Design a protein around this ligand. Structure first.
Ligand SMILES: O=P(O)(O)O[C@H]1[C@H](OP(=O)(O)O)[C@@H](OP(=O)(O)O)[C@H](OP(=O)(O)O)[C@@H](OP(=O)(O)O)[C@H]1OP(=O)(O)O
Length: 56
RNA sequence: GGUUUCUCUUCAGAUCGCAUAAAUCUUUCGCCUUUUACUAAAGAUUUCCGUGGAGAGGAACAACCCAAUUUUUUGAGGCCUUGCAAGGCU
């Protein structure tokens, strides 16, 4: 923002340089995909196989 | 003999990747009723999004000029004495 809004360009809602913000989430998603595949596999296993009686 | 393009196997040393996530455990910290979810540094171990080398199979596109000094175009041949060799010669 401070680099975009310089000179004649004033403060206001028009900056559209979206690569940086987009990039950060993509890296978040790289980490959270394994986690959710494991967690959601447990949710589905508990839904279809049933609750498992002996436990851990 | 080539190039491009898919699948599989194997080995990864290289900033394996001029980029960068998550989880588990152990130490120390911050939160302060308990547990999720957490705060932030160190170390260890995994997962995940990508990469490189090698090999095998399939498919597609192209093709079976120096003879005149310093070297290589000659100072080249002939005589005498001693035990071919040495020397004196022309
Ligand atoms: O200049 P703008 O494009 O209008 O941006 C504004 C403004 O930015 P600046 O004043 O820094 O130029 C706000 O800043 P404050 O007025 O609060 O100081 C900022 O707030 P943040 O600095 O917290 O981002 C606000 O963001 P938001 O609308 O989320 O409050 C943001 O507007 P946008 O970022 O939404 O364009």
């Amino acid at each position: 923002y401070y680099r975009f809004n310089t000179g004649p360009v004033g403060k206001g809602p028009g900056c559209g340089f979206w690569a940086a913000g987009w990039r950060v989430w993509l890296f978040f998603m790289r980490g959270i995909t394994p986690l959710l595949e494991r967690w959601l596999g447990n949710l589905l296993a508990r839904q279809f196989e049933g609750r498992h009686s002996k436990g851990v």
